[PDB]
Amino acid sequence: AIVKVTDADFDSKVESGVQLVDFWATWCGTCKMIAPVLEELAADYEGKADILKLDVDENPSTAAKYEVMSIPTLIVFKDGQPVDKVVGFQPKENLAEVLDKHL
């Protein structure tokens, strides 16, 4: 469902189309709370968008590159460029809304 991404293959996986990247960490309670919401969302958009996860403790440079200061942070990418951002907890509805705005 949700594919992991790291500093090493980020540019490889985020280059074409629309991707939603979830910047999370194991110590993040709110991040665990949105995880199930993204797994559903991912299904709702198979073939439309890719949902990726990037652990900020193990991949500090990508987090620094996109100014990710607080988590969770979800960033929408389109053809390798960040076009939108969502912070904090968000119900499935609100996330689907942000995606259709870029498809």
Say what the resolution is, in angstroms.
2.2
48 in helix, strand or coil? Answer: coil
36 in helix, strand or coil? Answer: helix
In the chain, where does DSSP find H-type helix? 10-13, 29-44, 60-65, 92-100
CB 51 within 8 A of CB 2: yes
**What's the CATH number where 76 sits?**
3.40.30.10
For 73, residues 6+ apart whose C-beta sits below 8 A from its C-beta are 23, 85, 86, 87
- Provide the domain count of the chain: 1
Q: How many CB atoms lie within 10 A of CB 13?
A: 17
CB 80 within 8 A of CB 16: yes
Residues recognised as catalytic: 28, 31
- DSSP state string for 56-78: TTT-HHHHHHTT--SSSEEEEEE
Q: Which residue range forms the structural domain that includes residue 27? A: 1-103
Method: X-ray
Tokens encoding 60? 């500090």
